């Protein structure tokens, strides 16, 4: 055969991301002395739209503590913040929506977002619209905090990792149908070249493992092994179950 499409996507020629209208990378402020010991105050100047991203962005400007200068950071907007608002960041910040606190300074049940996985990587977890992380316990010895992630899984983080109080704006986005191929076109136009999708059963055997034969079919089962060799991984990759997750078809 020939090289198939999911193999072809890794050389990254026409499959790279479309990043022209994007505002910049959205990450937290760099951890330093002021956030490590006290707090610092900035002000949010504008809330803007970012191309290829469901959640809006916030432009929070702070002061440089070693030079007479201003520093502007790009945050992801939590639901409720507005222009002209003060944002406090650091160890001694108060528990208000929009503030940036370490995870060892929040009580149980607190709703945080844009959470660092390691202390100092400036935001990794719960960054899409409508998502959040729930604090579900602490460990004062061993300096660890237990969290629940948006997928349902549980994780244990160092208490020096930071997070922003609140839920990320833009929720309820997928509750609307698209209704139109043109709407899907204009959606993926600002992300990457991955739409439309031809089915593998509609190709020839040179192009795909599922291609060929009269009466379009997959000849064998579609569950692949985990140790397949990268031209074979087409289907359901390492599935532990199949079915409906609902068992009733109607609720």
């Amino acid at each position: 055969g020939r090289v198939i499409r999911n193999q072809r996507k890794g050389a990254g020629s026409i499959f790279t991301s479309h990043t022209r209208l994007r505002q910049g990378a959205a990450k937290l402020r760099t951890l330093d002395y002021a956030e490590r010991h006290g707090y610092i105050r900035g002000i949010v100047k504008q809330i803007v739209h970012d191309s290829g991203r469901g959640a809006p962005l916030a432009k929070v400007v702070f002061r440089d503590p070693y030079k007479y200068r201003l520093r502007e950071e790009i945050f992801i907007a939590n639901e409720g913040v507005h222009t002209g608002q003060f944002i406090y960041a650091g160890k001694k910040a108060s528990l208000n929506v929009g503030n940036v606190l370490p995870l060892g300074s929040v009580p149980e049940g607190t709703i945080v977002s844009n959470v660092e996985e390691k202390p100092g990587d400036r935001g990794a977890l719960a960054r899409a619209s409508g998502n959040y992380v729930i604090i579900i316990g602490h460990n004062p010895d061993e300096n660890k905090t237990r969290v629940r992630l948006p997928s349902g899984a549980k994780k244990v983080i160092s208490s020096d990792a930071r997070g922003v109080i609140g839920v990320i704006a833009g929720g309820g986005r997928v509750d609307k149908p698209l209704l139109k191929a043109g709407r899907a076109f204009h959606k993926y136009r600002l992300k990457r070249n991955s739409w439309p999708k031809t089915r593998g059963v509609a190709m020839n055997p040179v192009d795909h493992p599922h291609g060929g034969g009269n009466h379009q079919h997959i000849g064998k089962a579609s569950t692949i092994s985990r140790g397949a060799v990268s031209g074979q991984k087409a289907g359901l990759i390492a599935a532990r179950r199949t079915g409906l997750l609902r068992g009733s078809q109607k609720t």
């Binding site: 997928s151 349902g152 899984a153 549980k154 509750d175 532990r240 997750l245 609902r246 109607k250 609720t251």
Partner: protein, 65 residues
């Protein structure tokens, strides 16, 4: 520690599967009873949601030079 990897991966898959089943139940419960309601009920529920959804400066002295 030879059990910790397989046990942590097992617990993580069970927690992910519970979350998946929960979100699927919630989305099917949203999509049905909405696609299965006529224009009358649709307009009524739309109308319902559109309906219900020390001066401090005193401690300061005066005529100060």
């Amino acid at each position: 520690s030879m059990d910790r990897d397989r046990l942590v991966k097992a617990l993580n898959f069970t927690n992910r599967l519970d979350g998946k089943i929960a979100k699927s139940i919630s989305r099917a419960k949203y999509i049905q009873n909405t696609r299965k309601a006529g224009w009358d009920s649709t307009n009524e529920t739309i109308k319902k949601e559109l309906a219900f959804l020390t001066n401090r400066f005193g401690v300061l002295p005066d005529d100060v030079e």
